[PDB]
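Recall from the previous lesson that a structure prediction takes nothing but the amino acid sequence as input. Here we apply that procedure to Obscurin-like protein 1 from Homo sapiens. The sequence below is the only information supplied.
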Amino acid sequence: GSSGSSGPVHILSPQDKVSLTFTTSERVVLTCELSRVDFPATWYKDGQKVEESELLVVKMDGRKHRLILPEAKVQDSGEFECRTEGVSAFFGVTVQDPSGPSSG
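The prediction returns the following tokens.
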């Protein structure tokens, strides 16, 4: 038993809007917790679904969701959100390219 809850699922962390900054050609891994184990969710970037691929790794864990990135490109820079059946989180990301002497 041990039942008696009002909301289906509520986020535990973060608590409020966060801010993060990384450098191009680096690894970016976010973090998010939930109040429900084995619960579905969809990541959104800049208000647009994320294109899961080799450049985008999505790890899921009991009441724990995070977005990993092998190559944080200037494009990867934006706001992330772990949409779910209840609430959503906000993670600020900024990929700043390192000062390079006209190097390609």
